[PDB]
Amino acid sequence: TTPEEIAQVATISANGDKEIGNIISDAMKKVGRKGVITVKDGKTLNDELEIIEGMKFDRGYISPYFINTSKGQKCEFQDAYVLLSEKKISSIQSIVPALEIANAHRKPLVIIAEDVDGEALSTLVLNRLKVGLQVVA
Amino acid sequence: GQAFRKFLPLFDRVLVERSAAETVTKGGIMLPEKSQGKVLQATVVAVGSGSKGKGGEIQPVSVKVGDKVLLPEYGGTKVVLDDKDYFLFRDGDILGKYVD
Amino acid sequence: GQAFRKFLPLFDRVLVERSAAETVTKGGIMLPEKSQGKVLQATVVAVGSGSKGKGGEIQPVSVKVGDKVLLPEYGGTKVVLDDKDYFLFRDGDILGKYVD
Amino acid sequence: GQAFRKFLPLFDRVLVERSAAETVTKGGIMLPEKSQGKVLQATVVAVGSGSKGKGGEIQPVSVKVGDKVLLPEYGGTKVVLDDKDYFLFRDGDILGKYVD
Ligand SMILES: [Mg+2]
């Protein structure tokens, strides 16, 4: 009934290591008692706990030209429209109205799709590098 | 037959200039030039004297110079006049003229 | 010939618009749009002047504007007038018309 | 031409209805429906106005409505009138009529 008991159980089960017990108790405080906790190796001498909130998935860019924050080489928008496609966006006609909405409302657009082919990529990169449209695929 | 830039096509042959390909949509989205295809809207800049399908008189070309017309996909010949592109079609190959 | 939306077809070409594809049956079952195919029913919105089958006079088109016709499966040209799709056929390619 | 079910074919096109395929022999042996094929015997239910094979006058169609005819195995177009199947042929495609 207490997180101190959680820390005590994790400390006893880790051969009396109170740092492992404390870090498991902190992870279980943050993501919940029935949450997801994954162990992996570290490149640093000390153990560390990283909390990933929201919906983070391991898919990067499609075009490197979409970077609008050169400090971390990343794409950064706030209050952005999201266009989700179950199929790979291929035709130009399938991407022109979404860009028209995103430009008429003056709001960024994140296009999450199965893939984006060369024509739609060329339209997106041209509208980013020529007129300055806030888009990312 | 009408001659355009020292060029007069023979028989029922119509020389047209294709309209400029679109690059910016109505909402402000710029379009890539490579995915624009060929423009099917043209304007007639030269006409021939026509053909002899009926014996005796000569048949004038249905279109005239200064008419906007709709082109088919295939059937044109590229003519380079003063390093500018024009397209030669037949009189019967023209689909229809925009009237106003 | 009679023009439609500032477009007059040339010779014996006929511009029609396809009828709306069915989406719900008489029993009340909704249809998927990808299995609809191509609508063979149309109405004539523009006619041309016609061709010259014989010497002298010019032959008018058999159909007129406002006639419902049955189209063949193939033999039409897609014409985009103000971002709406119309189809250009020949006069002889029309299978028949519905009289009333 | 003579219309049928609000359908009048154009030019020298003949709309016919195929006869019912046989399912029982003269002795009493029933036939499977999947091996019947297409019936080459039909009856004329609609005729066109004919074709302009010669200049001036219009040529009537050789067959009239109510003639039993023999169809070639290729050359017909399927037409769905009142959810019933009919076939369009040319006037010259008809092989011969059964006279009585
Ligand atoms: Mg243990």
CA distances from A102 to A96, A98, B53, B54 (A): 10, 6, 57, 60
Interchain CB contact of A87 with B (< 8 Å):
no
The position carrying tokens 């017990």 is A21
CB C93 within 8 A of CB C75: yes
DSSP strand pairing (C77-81 vs C84-90): antiparallel
Interchain CB contact of C50 with B (< 8 Å):
no
Which chains does chain B touch, 3 or more C-beta pairs < 8 A?
A: A, C
Which residues in B lie closer than 8 A to residue A103 (C-beta atoms)?
A: 27-29
The position carrying tokens 């190796």 is A41
Resolution in A: 3.0
Which SS3 state, helix, strand or coil, does residue B88 take? strand
DSSP strand pairing (C41-47 vs C68-70): antiparallel
Question: How many cross-chain Cβ pairs, C to D, lie less than 8 Å apart?
Answer: 41
How far is residue C87's CA from residue D14's CA, in Å, rounded to a whole number? 25
- Single out the residue of A16, A27, A20, A22 nearest to residue A4, CA to CA: A22
Pairwise CB contact (< 8 Å): C3 & B54: no
Of C59, C62, C100, the CB nearest to D10: C62
Beta pairing partners, D13 = D90
DSSP strand pairing (D41-47 vs D13-18): antiparallel
CA distances from D79 to B100, C72, C95 (A): 39, 10, 10
CA of A30 relative to ligand 1 center, distance in Å: 24
CA of C40 relative to ligand 1 center, distance in Å: 76
Angle between helices A18-31 and A3-13 (to 10 degrees): 140
Interchain CB contact of B27 with A (< 8 Å):
yes
CA of A4 relative to ligand 1 center, distance in Å: 19
CA of A1 relative to ligand 1 center, distance in Å: 22
What does R_g of chain C's alpha carbons equal in angstroms? 15
Both tokens assigned to A45: 């001498």
CB A75 within 8 A of CB A124: no
Residue type, D55: G
Kind plus residue range of the DSSP H or E element containing C19? none
Both tokens assigned to B79: 């003519």
Pairwise CB contact (< 8 Å): C95 & D3: no
Pairwise CB contact (< 8 Å): D10 & C59: no
CA of A14 relative to ligand 1 center, distance in Å: 7
Q: How far is B8 from chain C (nearest CA, A)?
A: 23
Interchain CB contact of A92 with B (< 8 Å):
yes
Both tokens assigned to B93: 């190959």
Which SS3 state, helix, strand or coil, does residue A99 take? helix
Q: Around Cβ D59, how many Cβ atoms within 10 Å? A: 13
Pairwise CB contact (< 8 Å): B27 & A130: no
CB C17 within 8 A of CB C80: no
Beta pairing partners, C42 = C18, C69
* Listed residues: CB within 5 A of ion ligand 1: A 13
Pairwise CB contact (< 8 Å): C7 & B94: no
- Backbone φ and ψ of B86, nearest 5°: -135, 165
- Single out the residue of B81, B75, B63, B60 nearest to residue B17, CA to CA: B81
Which SS3 state, helix, strand or coil, does residue B95 take? coil
DSSP states of B9-62: --SSEEEEEEPPPP-B-TTS-B--STT-----EEEEEEE-----SSSSSPPPPS
CA distances from C26 to B88, C22, C29, C30, C98 (A): 52, 10, 8, 10, 22
Angle ∠(C24,C29,C32) on CA atoms, nearest 5: 70
- Residue A100's closest chain B neighbor by CA? B27
Helix (H), strand (E), coil (C) string for chain D: CECCCCCEECCCEEEEEECCCCCECCCCCECCHHHCCCCCEEEEEEECCCCCCCCCCCCCCCCCCCCEEECCCCCCEEEEECCEEEEEEECCCCCEEECC
| C-to-N gaps above 2.5 Å in chain D, after residues | none
